[PDB]
Amino acid sequence: KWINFQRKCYYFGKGTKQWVHARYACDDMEGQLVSIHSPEEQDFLTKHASHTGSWIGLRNLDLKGEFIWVDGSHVDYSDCVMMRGSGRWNDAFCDRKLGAWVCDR
Amino acid sequence: VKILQSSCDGGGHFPPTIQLCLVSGYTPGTIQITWLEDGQVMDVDLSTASTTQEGELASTQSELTLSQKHWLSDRTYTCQVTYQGHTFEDSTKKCADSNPRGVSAYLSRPSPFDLFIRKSPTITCLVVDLAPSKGTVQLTWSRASGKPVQHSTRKEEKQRNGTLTVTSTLPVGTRDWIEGETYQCRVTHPHLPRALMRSTTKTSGPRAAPEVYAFATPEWPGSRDKRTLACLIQNFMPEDISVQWLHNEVQLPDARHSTTQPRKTKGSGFFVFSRLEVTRAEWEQKDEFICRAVHEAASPSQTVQRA
Amino acid sequence: KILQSSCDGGGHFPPTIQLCLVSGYTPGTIQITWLEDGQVMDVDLSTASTTQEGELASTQSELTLSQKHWLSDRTYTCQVTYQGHTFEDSTKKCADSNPRGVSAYLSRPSPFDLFIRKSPTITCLVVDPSKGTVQLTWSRASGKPVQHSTRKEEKQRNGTLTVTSTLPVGTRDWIEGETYQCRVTHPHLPRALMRSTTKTSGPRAAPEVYAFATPEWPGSRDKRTLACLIQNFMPEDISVQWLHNEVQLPDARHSTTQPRKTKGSGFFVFSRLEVTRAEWEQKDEFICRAVHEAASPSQTVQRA
């Protein structure tokens, strides 16, 4: 069911859910929220990107200030952050709902 | 997609006809809308469908008419949406009555000290009951997503004025609260006809750093050994704030220290006042009193202190 | 027709509540105003959007409310002003089939009316309607005659009648210890409801007033804040007022906290006042006056 690219498996889930509710869906389907490190990896996500927007594994802990990925790795290639239809990311509300989510394993 | 029910009149009485549902914008294509009644498909003639194209995304709205006897019979209605990926679901149910026979419940958010410094955030459900009769005050706990919860400390304190007050302290996750998780609570009583439901989450909105100001009272005729300290913490959002008093690097407990309720400023922000009484032996040993304030938008490391 | 936000599967209330929807009308300029039981709400909280469909024009307003504001049992009204008529529509939280009885509230006169204004008055606020037969009888504990009270009734938008009775009480009589009785009778109620109030007899203490000024903070230049502390006084009845150029500033400008108990016998209150650059430059003197029962001289304790 998961669409493959490079080596990592990707699932493009649909349904009106919050960032935290979309995060639980990735855990139940054995895995976690999408983490981008390579520039070529973004090109694959744009092909299956939703017009409304898809939630990405970028979040704020507030204690450090800087943004860190869901797994724990530092952000290299570029409030709960979402992904636009064009490709680029932007700052959004935590309670905000979107009809698309991306999980990776 | 979000389902919007018909509002009650001025008195609070239910209208004879109930109108529901509203579906958000999507990519143009053929859609399937099906009405459910607790896992049972309703008649297509009762609902009306209308599609409207706005810019690039397409919007559709379904309106199902229901009688007062059908809606108030305690039945959950689900709007099944079928588009590409198979199925989509959103459920709607009747609202439980508030303040039945003078019974009010209060659910407060965890203090910033427990969320950042102590790292152990807890939610307290304070329910005030004026008529203590033969029955139970069952405090059921649940999550918005459907995740399991730990057992809460259910302690009841019978007051001298003839009222019973029971509190339930639920231990919530540190990372889960900041992410945006909504914690639900259900209150039931055998004497009460309808249940009580109160739920709280992280107040998503504007963030502002608090402004701490320290003040000391001069010598007043009559008092010689005891003196009072006044503190002002203003311009901050959300209303969640922790006030601490320090002397000789050690924090002071809830005693002596008193803090007012978060009141709105003539502006955006919020303001809180702190009062502390100190003896002659305290200032002579160490003439330094630091008041610590913990906030969500506070910096550095959620710590704003003034001497 | 107003449309409220639906509850989840379990029946739990959502954190944010969204309201209102206005039907089609003849094209023209419209005015939408939000009410909270006869009180105009802030325009920033609501969002307006107009859409033209065929010949008739449709407009929709969306007001965001917290769970603590919606479940506190308060009626919201959407006032629509078009062609100089006005169309009202009210929304309320789901309630029971008319619970509890008729409640009456009798409040003591404020220290400003008792000492400064010298005209103390007692207001009897009774919350209820089947028939307009609400009687407010006045009597004294000793058996002395009383003047006629201003009986004014205000029918609320939520379907309840609220009648207030303002009785003019004596200045010297209140301090001496006179108890004023009130009788409220209704055909629906079986027993006659009676509420009476007097001067809070107990220990008396003079209030301690302290004046403080906030220094310059980065970001703010024109506006400054003034903090005042009034502590150690009994009873809880206290009047807080700010003075500038020998005249009293309006009640809307200054904010005062509820009377809280000290770690000791007494009570404490905090006062906050926001002032502009034009205020202190014209006159650099701000005095906060406190009125109390045990206050001296002549029930006036002020500090600059």
Ligand SMILES: *[C@@H]1O[C@H](CO)[C@@H](O[C@@H]2O[C@H](CO)[C@@H](O[C@@H]3O[C@H](CO)[C@@H](O)[C@H](O)[C@@H]3O)[C@H](O)[C@H]2NC(C)=O)[C@H](O)[C@H]1NC(C)=O
């Ligand atoms: C319909 O709307 C009116 C709004 O005016 C509601 O009346 C308000 O009811 C509350 C609660 O009974 C009153 O508050 C009480 O005030 C006294 C005196 O300050 C205080 O001692 C009590 O602790 C309490 O706070 C409030 O004064 C009253 N407003 C007026 C102007 O009478 C009414 O309850 C609403 N109806 C329903 C069914 O909700």
Ligand SMILES: *[C@@H]1O[C@H](CO)[C@@H](O)[C@H](O)[C@H]1NC(C)=O
């Ligand atoms: C009874 O005492 C409790 C103490 O917590 C208080 O909250 C409550 O309002 C009091 N009830 C009355 C009727 O004064």
